[PDB]
Amino acid sequence: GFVVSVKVEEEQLLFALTDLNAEIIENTSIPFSSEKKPEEAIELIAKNVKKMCNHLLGVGIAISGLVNRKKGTVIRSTMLGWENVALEAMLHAHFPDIPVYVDKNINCYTLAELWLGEGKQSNNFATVSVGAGLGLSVVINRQIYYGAQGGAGEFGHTTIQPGGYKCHCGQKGCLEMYASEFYFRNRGEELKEAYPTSELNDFHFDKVAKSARAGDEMATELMGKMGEYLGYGIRNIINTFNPEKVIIVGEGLHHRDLFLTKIDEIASQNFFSGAGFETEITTTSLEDPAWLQGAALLVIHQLF
């Protein structure tokens, strides 16, 4: 009795085999750029699901973008450049009598928080992810809020700087262009000429954090500003939702020492704290594999 879950990131596919309590039995990571390559990615997924396995009760998939959870399709992921991808149908060519379920990445994480994490107690909280992009999932009554057609929570594509950086979504000035890994490239390209002896020219989160800790001037400017914008974003979430608490999650937390304080400084100055009512902003006690545990719970709740 087992479930297989998948997280489709932009530069790697993650897999796990879990039991019926979403406890991980095995997990792996396959380097692959899925950008504009859904068919090839899905063949790799099928191959790697088969590799991990009769008593496969389902496959759960966490992915970026607008998903139709009813049909198992990826309507629009501008993170991946995927347009109307029939993910469930395509995997069912390989695994005919195995349920496939798809949901937005951060919604899957939030299922994990609800069942295993600091969303055990709470009934109204928000989950914000930091890393490659910026994600949001809001829980209202221990239920994820999906909005009219499952698209709620594209908080990364709220405008934080009108007229600012061009986003992958087609808009200018999206929060994700300032309050995620994308900022390091957007701003780092502009700063090259001013900082010609910077170590830094790979703008992945890890590399930027490494250089910032090493005292590189450009890297610390990038990391400092990204934290400020993330602070604005979390403040916005607070003033908008009045959540009981905000739970920060995501791979960016490997470098939390470089931005959490900045987030707290900004986000704790909010509409309700002006009256003396503080909103708790806390980091998840779950780790990176909870994206996969959550995608598994996607299947498990469909069963029971």
Ligand X SMILES: OC[C@H]1O[C@H](OC[C@H]2O[C@H](O)[C@H](O)[C@@H](O)[C@@H]2O)[C@H](O)[C@@H](O)[C@@H]1O
Site of interaction with ligand X (CB under 6 A): 9, 64-65, 79, 104-106, 129-135, 154, 156, 176, 250-251
Annotated ligand binding at 169? The verdict is yes
Q: Residue from 95, 115, 195, 232 that binds its own copies (CB under 8 A)?
A: 232
At position 9, the amino acid (one-letter code) is: E
Closest by CA position to 87, among listed 295, 232, 297: 295
- Span of 27-35, 136-144, 166-174, 257-265 interacting with Cl ion by CB under 5 A: 166-174
To its own copies, the closest distance from the beta carbon of 94 in angstroms equals 26
- Span of 3-11, 22-30, 141-149, 186-194 interacting with its own copies by CB under 8 A: 141-149
Q: Residue from 1, 275, 278, 304 that binds its own copies (CB under 8 A)?
A: 275
Closest by CA position to 215, among listed 191, 193, 197: 197
Angle 29-30-36 from CA coordinates, rounded to 5°: 125
Q: Is 281 helix (H, G, I), strand (E, B) or coil?
A: strand
Question: With CB cut-offs between 5 and 8 Å by kind, which of Cl ion, its own copies, Zn ion, none does residue 240 bind?
Answer: its own copies
Touching its own copies, residues 70-89 (CB under 8 A): 75-76, 78, 83-84
Q: Residue from 170, 197, 215, 278 that binds its own copies (CB under 8 A)?
A: 170
* Identity of the residue, 73 or 105, whose beta carbon is nearer to ligand X in the bound complex: 105
* Identity of the residue, 85 or 160, whose beta carbon is nearer to Cl ion in the bound complex: 160
Question: With CB cut-offs between 5 and 8 Å by kind, which of its own copies, ligand X, Cl ion, none does residue 232 bind?
Answer: its own copies
CB atoms closer than 10 angstroms to residue 173: 17
Angle 121-122-127 from CA coordinates, rounded to 5°: 125
**For the sheet containing 56-63, what is the strand order?**
24-31, 12-18, 2-8, 56-63, 100-104
Cα 236 from Cα 155, distance rounded (Å):
10
* Identity of the residue, 28 or 171, whose beta carbon is nearer to Zn ion in the bound complex: 171
**How many angstroms from the chain centroid is the CA of residue 50?**
26
Annotated ligand binding at 168? The verdict is no
Cα 249 from Cα 287, distance rounded (Å):
8
Which DSSP state fits 210?
Answer: H
Annotated binding site for Zn(2+): 157, 167, 169, 174
Task: Give the footprint of Cl ion on this chain (CB under 5 A).
Answer: 171-172
